[PDB]
Tab-separated table of all heavy atoms in Angstrom:
chain	number	residue	atom	x	y	z
B	516	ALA	N	111.056	-20.781	-65.796
B	516	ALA	CA	110.947	-19.671	-66.824
B	516	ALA	C	109.577	-19.671	-67.392
B	516	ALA	O	108.932	-18.696	-67.606
B	516	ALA	CB	112.032	-19.664	-67.663
B	517	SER	N	109.116	-20.947	-67.767
B	517	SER	CA	107.847	-21.071	-68.510
B	517	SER	C	106.705	-20.550	-67.590
B	517	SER	O	105.814	-19.897	-68.077
B	517	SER	CB	107.549	-22.511	-68.837
B	517	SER	OG	106.442	-22.717	-69.607
B	518	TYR	N	106.653	-21.013	-66.271
B	518	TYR	CA	105.483	-20.677	-65.455
B	518	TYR	C	105.722	-19.154	-65.019
B	518	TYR	O	104.674	-18.480	-64.649
B	518	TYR	CB	105.338	-21.631	-64.352
B	518	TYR	CG	104.489	-22.704	-64.720
B	518	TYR	CD1	104.985	-23.726	-65.445
B	518	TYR	CD2	103.074	-22.811	-64.332
B	518	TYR	CE1	104.198	-24.820	-65.851
B	518	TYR	CE2	102.302	-23.872	-64.730
B	518	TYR	CZ	102.834	-24.913	-65.519
B	518	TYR	OH	102.145	-26.001	-65.790
B	519	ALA	N	106.920	-18.645	-65.024
B	519	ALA	CA	107.088	-17.175	-64.751
B	519	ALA	C	106.508	-16.399	-65.941
B	519	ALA	O	105.718	-15.412	-65.694
B	519	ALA	CB	108.575	-16.911	-64.602
B	520	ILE	N	106.828	-16.787	-67.116
B	520	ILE	CA	106.322	-16.049	-68.373
B	520	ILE	C	104.727	-16.173	-68.432
B	520	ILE	O	104.005	-15.266	-68.704
B	520	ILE	CB	106.889	-16.555	-69.693
B	520	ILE	CG1	108.394	-16.331	-69.670
B	520	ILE	CG2	106.202	-15.875	-70.819
B	520	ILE	CD1	109.036	-16.765	-70.995
B	521	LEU	N	104.219	-17.319	-68.128
B	521	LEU	CA	102.896	-17.573	-68.057
B	521	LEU	C	102.145	-16.736	-66.980
B	521	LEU	O	101.105	-16.187	-67.301
B	521	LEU	CB	102.515	-19.110	-67.746
B	521	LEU	CG	101.031	-19.492	-67.745
B	521	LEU	CD1	100.334	-19.096	-69.047
B	521	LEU	CD2	100.864	-21.036	-67.424
B	522	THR	N	102.761	-16.590	-65.809
B	522	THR	CA	102.229	-15.757	-64.772
B	522	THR	C	102.232	-14.342	-65.267
B	522	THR	O	101.145	-13.601	-64.969
B	522	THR	CB	103.027	-15.905	-63.506
B	522	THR	OG1	103.337	-17.176	-63.159
B	522	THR	CG2	102.278	-15.225	-62.335
B	523	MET	N	103.178	-13.927	-66.017
B	523	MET	CA	103.219	-12.478	-66.481
B	523	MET	C	102.155	-12.232	-67.479
B	523	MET	O	101.491	-11.254	-67.539
B	523	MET	CB	104.583	-12.216	-66.989
B	523	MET	CG	105.698	-12.056	-66.003
B	523	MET	SD	107.272	-11.542	-66.665
B	523	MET	CE	108.276	-11.241	-65.228
B	524	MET	N	101.839	-13.216	-68.409
B	524	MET	CA	100.961	-13.237	-69.414
B	524	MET	C	99.519	-13.117	-68.799
B	524	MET	O	98.772	-12.249	-69.142
B	524	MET	CB	100.873	-14.476	-70.326
B	524	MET	CG	102.117	-14.520	-71.248
B	524	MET	SD	102.116	-16.081	-72.240
B	524	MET	CE	103.473	-15.772	-73.383
B	525	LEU	N	99.207	-14.035	-67.871
B	525	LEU	CA	97.990	-13.971	-67.148
B	525	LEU	C	97.783	-12.680	-66.343
B	525	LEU	O	96.697	-12.264	-66.219
B	525	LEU	CB	97.888	-15.214	-66.164
B	525	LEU	CG	97.751	-16.534	-66.841
B	525	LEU	CD1	97.775	-17.652	-65.704
B	525	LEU	CD2	96.483	-16.636	-67.689
B	526	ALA	N	98.902	-12.059	-65.941
B	526	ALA	CA	98.866	-10.815	-65.255
B	526	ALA	C	98.439	-9.637	-66.207
B	526	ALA	O	97.645	-8.769	-65.837
B	526	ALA	CB	100.172	-10.551	-64.590
B	527	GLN	N	99.041	-9.627	-67.374
B	527	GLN	CA	98.802	-8.551	-68.329
B	527	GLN	C	97.367	-8.695	-68.948
B	527	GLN	O	96.722	-7.665	-69.142
B	527	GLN	CB	99.746	-8.533	-69.488
B	527	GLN	CG	99.720	-7.402	-70.328
B	527	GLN	CD	100.409	-7.613	-71.723
B	527	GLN	OE1	100.065	-8.505	-72.499
B	527	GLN	NE2	101.416	-6.700	-72.045
B	528	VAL	N	96.949	-9.908	-69.197
B	528	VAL	CA	95.638	-10.202	-69.732
B	528	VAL	C	94.543	-9.893	-68.768
B	528	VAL	O	93.432	-9.332	-69.122
B	528	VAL	CB	95.469	-11.684	-70.255
B	528	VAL	CG1	94.068	-11.928	-70.734
B	528	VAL	CG2	96.473	-11.901	-71.346
B	529	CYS	N	94.748	-10.192	-67.443
B	529	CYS	CA	93.779	-9.867	-66.344
B	529	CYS	C	93.985	-8.517	-65.837
B	529	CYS	O	93.201	-8.170	-64.924
B	529	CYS	CB	93.831	-10.959	-65.438
B	529	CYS	SG	93.458	-12.661	-65.984
B	530	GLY	N	95.024	-7.860	-66.303
B	530	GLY	CA	95.258	-6.456	-65.876
B	530	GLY	C	96.031	-6.379	-64.381
B	530	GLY	O	95.609	-5.479	-63.637
B	531	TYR	N	96.822	-7.305	-64.135
B	531	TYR	CA	97.587	-7.315	-62.933
B	531	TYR	C	99.065	-7.196	-63.215
B	531	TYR	O	99.540	-7.040	-64.326
B	531	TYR	CB	97.251	-8.554	-62.156
B	531	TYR	CG	95.848	-8.784	-61.819
B	531	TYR	CD1	95.091	-9.812	-62.260
B	531	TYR	CD2	95.259	-7.876	-60.733
B	531	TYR	CE1	93.783	-9.984	-61.921
B	531	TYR	CE2	94.008	-8.046	-60.444
B	531	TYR	CZ	93.169	-9.167	-60.875
B	531	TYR	OH	91.920	-9.294	-60.617
B	532	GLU	N	99.867	-7.263	-62.168
B	532	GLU	CA	101.314	-7.198	-62.221
B	532	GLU	C	101.908	-8.507	-61.602
B	532	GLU	O	101.279	-9.128	-60.754
B	532	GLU	CB	101.893	-6.050	-61.451
B	532	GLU	CG	101.528	-4.691	-62.041
B	532	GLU	CD	102.049	-3.576	-61.290
B	532	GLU	OE1	102.561	-3.756	-60.165
B	532	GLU	OE2	102.071	-2.439	-61.808
B	533	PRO	N	103.059	-8.948	-62.172
B	533	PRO	CA	103.660	-10.275	-61.649
B	533	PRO	C	104.009	-10.144	-60.202
B	533	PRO	O	104.390	-9.068	-59.736
B	533	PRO	CB	104.977	-10.388	-62.530
B	533	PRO	CG	105.182	-8.942	-63.035
B	533	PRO	CD	103.851	-8.410	-63.256
B	534	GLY	N	103.962	-11.285	-59.466
B	534	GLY	CA	104.181	-11.229	-58.027
B	534	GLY	C	105.196	-12.270	-57.775
B	534	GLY	O	106.512	-12.050	-58.007
B	535	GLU	N	104.970	-13.299	-57.085
B	535	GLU	CA	105.935	-14.388	-56.646
B	535	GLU	C	105.555	-15.789	-57.396
B	535	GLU	O	104.456	-16.021	-57.721
B	535	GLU	CB	105.886	-14.497	-55.231
B	535	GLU	CG	106.232	-13.223	-54.492
B	535	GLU	CD	106.214	-13.387	-53.017
B	535	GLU	OE1	105.858	-14.520	-52.436
B	535	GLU	OE2	106.453	-12.383	-52.244
B	536	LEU	N	106.662	-16.524	-57.537
B	536	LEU	CA	106.561	-17.888	-58.099
B	536	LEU	C	107.061	-18.980	-57.177
B	536	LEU	O	108.261	-19.015	-56.888
B	536	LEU	CB	107.285	-18.027	-59.368
B	536	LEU	CG	107.257	-19.343	-60.070
B	536	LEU	CD1	105.846	-19.842	-60.366
B	536	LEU	CD2	108.153	-19.397	-61.304
B	537	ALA	N	106.188	-19.790	-56.653
B	537	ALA	CA	106.605	-20.863	-55.751
B	537	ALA	C	106.362	-22.274	-56.403
B	537	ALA	O	105.272	-22.631	-56.849
B	537	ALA	CB	105.782	-20.767	-54.477
B	538	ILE	N	107.456	-22.911	-56.597
B	538	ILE	CA	107.422	-24.288	-57.194
B	538	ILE	C	107.671	-25.442	-56.194
B	538	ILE	O	108.785	-25.481	-55.610
B	538	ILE	CB	108.463	-24.439	-58.316
B	538	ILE	CG1	108.146	-23.379	-59.447
B	538	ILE	CG2	108.468	-25.801	-58.912
B	538	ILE	CD1	109.029	-23.529	-60.652
B	539	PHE	N	106.750	-26.281	-55.967
B	539	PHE	CA	106.746	-27.372	-55.071
B	539	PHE	C	107.140	-28.633	-55.826
B	539	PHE	O	106.265	-29.056	-56.699
B	539	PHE	CB	105.490	-27.548	-54.335
B	539	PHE	CG	105.040	-26.298	-53.538
B	539	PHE	CD1	103.795	-25.836	-53.749
B	539	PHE	CD2	105.956	-25.594	-52.855
B	539	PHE	CE1	103.454	-24.689	-53.103
B	539	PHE	CE2	105.615	-24.499	-52.141
B	539	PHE	CZ	104.307	-24.015	-52.311
B	540	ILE	N	108.218	-29.291	-55.510
B	540	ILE	CA	108.744	-30.432	-56.334
B	540	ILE	C	108.505	-31.728	-55.552
B	540	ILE	O	108.876	-31.935	-54.431
B	540	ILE	CB	110.139	-30.206	-56.683
B	540	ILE	CG1	110.396	-28.924	-57.471
B	540	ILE	CG2	110.643	-31.418	-57.484
B	540	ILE	CD1	111.756	-28.692	-57.859
B	541	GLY	N	108.092	-32.816	-56.268
B	541	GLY	CA	107.919	-34.070	-55.702
B	541	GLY	C	109.231	-34.825	-55.833
B	541	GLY	O	110.095	-34.820	-55.001
B	542	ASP	N	109.401	-35.596	-56.936
B	542	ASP	CA	110.719	-36.270	-57.236
B	542	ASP	C	111.732	-35.421	-57.808
B	542	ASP	O	111.858	-35.229	-59.044
B	542	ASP	CB	110.319	-37.513	-58.069
B	542	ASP	CG	111.501	-38.474	-58.069
B	542	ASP	OD1	112.693	-38.125	-58.004
B	542	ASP	OD2	111.201	-39.728	-58.119
B	543	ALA	N	112.589	-34.774	-56.978
B	543	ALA	CA	113.656	-33.867	-57.407
B	543	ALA	C	114.861	-34.777	-57.643
B	543	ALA	O	115.534	-35.265	-56.644
B	543	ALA	CB	113.975	-32.793	-56.441
B	544	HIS	N	115.233	-34.984	-58.948
B	544	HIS	CA	116.333	-35.925	-59.197
B	544	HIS	C	117.300	-35.345	-60.185
B	544	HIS	O	117.129	-34.375	-61.076
B	544	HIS	CB	115.669	-37.203	-59.858
B	544	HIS	CG	114.777	-36.922	-60.992
B	544	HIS	ND1	115.232	-36.449	-62.166
B	544	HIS	CD2	113.469	-37.026	-61.059
B	544	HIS	CE1	114.228	-36.441	-63.031
B	544	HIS	NE2	113.117	-36.656	-62.365
B	545	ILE	N	118.549	-35.955	-60.214
B	545	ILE	CA	119.639	-35.558	-61.117
B	545	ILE	C	120.008	-36.815	-61.834
B	545	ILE	O	120.479	-37.813	-61.187
B	545	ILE	CB	120.803	-34.965	-60.430
B	545	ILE	CG1	120.479	-33.632	-59.889
B	545	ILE	CG2	121.976	-34.840	-61.401
B	545	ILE	CD1	121.647	-32.871	-59.196
Side-chain angles (χ1 to χ4, degrees):
Chain B
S517 186
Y518 276 76
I520 297 180
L521 179 57
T522 310
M523 289 185 174
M524 289 179 175
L525 291 176
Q527 191 199 57
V528 175
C529 300
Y531 299 111
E532 294 179 345
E535 301 176 2
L536 174 63
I538 299 183
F539 305 132
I540 302 180
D542 196 322
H544 55 69
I545 292 181

